[PDB]
Amino acid sequence: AMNINSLKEEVDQSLKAYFNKDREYNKVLYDSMAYSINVGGKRIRPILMLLSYYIYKSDYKKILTPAMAIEMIHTYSLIHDDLPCMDNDDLRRGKPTNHKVFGEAIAVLAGDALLNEAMKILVDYSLEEGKSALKATKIIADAAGSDGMIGGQIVDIINEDKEEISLKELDYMHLKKTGELIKASIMSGAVLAEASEGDIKKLEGFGYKLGLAFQIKDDILDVVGNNYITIFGLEECKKKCVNITEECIEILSSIKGNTEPLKVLTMKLLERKF
Amino acid sequence: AMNINSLKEEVDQSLKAYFNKDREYNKVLYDSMAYSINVGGKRIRPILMLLSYYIYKSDYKKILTPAMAIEMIHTYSLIHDDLPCMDNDDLRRGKPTNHKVFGEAIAVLAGDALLNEAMKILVDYSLEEGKSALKATKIIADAAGSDGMIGGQIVDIINEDSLKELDYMHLKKTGELIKASIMSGAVLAEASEGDIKKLEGFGYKLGLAFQIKDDILDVVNNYITIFGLEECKKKCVNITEECIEILSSIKGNTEPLKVLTMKLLERKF
């Protein structure tokens, strides 16, 4: 009865419940965090984690905590990236962004608090669950940090100036900015399920490639509606995405266990409209 | 054997080396992190951790990593607090603030990165050291977060626009991480449960006296606004004395921590 849309609603509900707690003084912080959490989203990253775990074990509800942590990290990055000094976005999915509603100071602090919240729950989860969870926590913490997501964002910032960007720097930027957390969602799920070394290397390649297709797809979604499109052209881009998604499917096919839900998500990611 | 000033220089060198490392594309992030890390500071939090651990074991060098992590967290809060949307400070200790040097976007990200770096190193340290290291990590994570330091900064912003609320602000903003420094050092040293209870109270009192002291220093809203200069001076002195008395009731090498506690009362910034 495993259904991606149903899974996304289950994540939405866990996240809402999480932030619906009683607070006497710092309620505004929790309102700001909850606003960005609840606003919306495909919940791609937490679903990747659950479905990678699902390849091996069916009790996915057991790792909803680390799944929420990763979506908290994704959410904090949007709050900070929307700020006037960076992307300066007023709207996200037709809704006002965090700083427009709560002002910049509170938005900065809610982003900081979501990053910190992800770490607190991963740490508590690891105190409960042991060594494999702490290992998964490292995968997540590393992918979010200076040599992952943040390192990506920095390069993006530093290059606003370049009229011209090298392929090397561009790939790095995209690998760090979005590649690492997509891949980390998959790897942490598998590590939590205690997949074997052979499977881990398969899933590493699958995570790398999925993230690649994802960044190119973002470029296509921008253009039609410093650019893979500028460098390769729309036709080649449309084609690379289909072909990488193909390889992703074949890697999953090479894995013994229940990879069907992950294959579904993988094809859905190729056809998303935003 | 001990010396607080040599310990400060030791933290200084550990941090200077930590940030000395090659990078191919995100080097500016590292320069910005290192900028705010190296500008200087008393290093009170990492020293508290080291001296609390020292009550119980003398190989404090073993926990320099977690001590660095708490200083990374303190440093990241300063970068964010300095931002134009917050305190909007151009200078700190005579030196340009991070955003004046690297711009606001990079400053926001360098703060984010320092928080994340503290967690990365505490996770790595816990993978190598086991359960007590991870319990110490939770103490630090929780004190830094929504119901700790950030909770404090939030209340401080909303109220810029009751004594219970003022109490909560100063305790969260400042108290929590001072207390967490002490408690994490004792947890890392595997202090008994009785000792932990005692140090929690010491940590709470020391953090209260620290915050009142900060408020007094501004003169040359506040605890000063609520109670008055003369009362605040008196509270600082009396809470410090209680701290000394708690330390005296603990079996172990508490002398260095007592010296720090007194120096904290006498400090000029």
TrEMBL record, chain B:
Pfam families: polyprenyl_synt (PF00348). Gene3D superfamilies: Farnesyl Diphosphate Synthase (1.10.600.10). Its cofactor is Mg(2+). Signal peptide: none annotated. It comes from the Bacteria. It catalyses: isopentenyl diphosphate + (2E)-geranyl diphosphate = (2E,6E)-farnesyl diphosphate + diphosphate. This is Farnesyl diphosphate synthase. PROSITE patterns: POLYPRENYL_SYNTHASE_1, POLYPRENYL_SYNTHASE_2. One of its GO terms (biological process) is farnesyl diphosphate biosynthetic process. It comes from Clostridium perfringens (strain 13 / Type A). Keywords: Isoprene biosynthesis, Magnesium, Metal-binding, Transferase. The keyword Magnesium applies. Belongs to the FPP/GGPP synthase family. GO terms for cellular component: cytoplasm. One of its GO terms (molecular function) is metal ion binding. Its EC number is 2.5.1.10. InterPro entries: Isoprenoid_synthase_dom_sf, Polyprenyl_synt, Polyprenyl_synt_CS, Prenyl_diphosphate_synthase.
